[PDB]
Amino acid sequence: ATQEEIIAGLAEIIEEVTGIEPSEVTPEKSFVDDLDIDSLSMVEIAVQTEDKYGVKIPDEDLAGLRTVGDVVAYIQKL
Amino acid sequence: FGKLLEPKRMARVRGWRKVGAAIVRWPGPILVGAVALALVGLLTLPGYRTNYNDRNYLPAD
Amino acid sequence: EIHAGINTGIIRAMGGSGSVVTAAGLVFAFTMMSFAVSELTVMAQVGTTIGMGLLFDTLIVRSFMTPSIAALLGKWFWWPQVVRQRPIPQPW
């Protein structure tokens, strides 16, 4: 499915960025409550996604997404 | 020979990646802020006087 | 580190090398700044000038200004070479 492949690509990104294993990165938990993420780490995720897997997430919209399911849904709706 | 040079703790690389991404996302405002501090440094420069007397650069004993 | 995107190159080279250059600058700068307690005034002046200049160069120029200019000029930073802003977008 497209959803699981996008989750796999994002999980590879989050593995490279903040050192969190892909096994328990699931779309059923949030970023800042469970993975202990920062605001600037969202910028890291955004920039790495822009270069590696070309798709545009603008400014002032990283804060709109809170869970991994929200981010993968945001990617697949484009 | 032994177990001497090994990396302990991972906290500086993550922070410097964070400030690098901060630079990348907003290259406009960070440049104008940095050059603003640069101008604050530079406006003092044209008023500058030297002293060729070393008598005032030594103790008095 | 250009080939996998230009500005991911900036973040990756920053995390790889800014730490090392800032560590070297900070050690040398504080070693030069400890000269300020000398009773010889001119040596204290030279040490304080070099130390304060190296804090300014390390902390606000090389850490904030130069990567900002590199990220603002973009692919025109490497002229006459023909570099690409992003790689070909790989599939999922």
Swiss-Prot record, chain A:
Post-translational modification note: 4'-phosphopantetheine is transferred from CoA to a specific serine of apo-AcpM.
GO biological process: lipid A biosynthetic process
Modified-residue entries (O-(pantetheine 4'-phosphoryl)serine), positions: 39
Subcellular location: Cytoplasm
Crosslinked residue numbers (Isoglutamyl lysine isopeptide (Lys-Gln) (interchain with Q-Cter in protein Pup)): 77
The Carrier domain, residue ranges: 1-78
Gene Ontology MF terms: acyl binding; acyl carrier activity
Alphabetized UniProt keyword annotations: Cytoplasm, Fatty acid biosynthesis, Fatty acid metabolism, Isopeptide bond, Lipid biosynthesis, Lipid metabolism, Phosphopantetheine, Phosphoprotein, Ubl conjugation
Residues spanning the signal sequence: none
Any single GO CC term annotated in Swiss-Prot or TrEMBL for this entry: membrane
Origin: domain of life: Bacteria
Family recorded in the similarity comment: Belongs to the acyl carrier protein (ACP) family.
Primary role: Acyl carrier protein involved in meromycolate extension.
Identification of the protein by name: Meromycolate extension acyl carrier protein
Organism: Mycolicibacterium smegmatis (strain ATCC 700084 / mc(2)155) (Mycobacterium smegmatis)
Originating gene: acpM
Full protein segment contained here: 3 to 80 of 99
Swiss-Prot record, chain B:
Highest taxon above the source species: Bacteria
Induction summary: Repressed by MmpR5. Repressed by iron. Regulation is IdeR-independent.
Localization annotation: Cell inner membrane
Parts of the chain that traverse the membrane: 26-46
Known function: Part of an export system, which is required for biosynthesis and secretion of siderophores. Overexpression of the system confers non-target based resistance to azoles, clofazimine and bedaquiline, via an efflux mechanism.
Family under the similarity heading: Belongs to the resistance-nodulation-cell division (RND) (TC 2.A.6) family. MmpL subfamily.
Subunit structure: Interacts with MmpS5. Can also interact with MmpS4.
Protein name as annotated: Siderophore exporter MmpL5
Organism (species): Mycobacterium tuberculosis (strain ATCC 25618 / H37Rv)
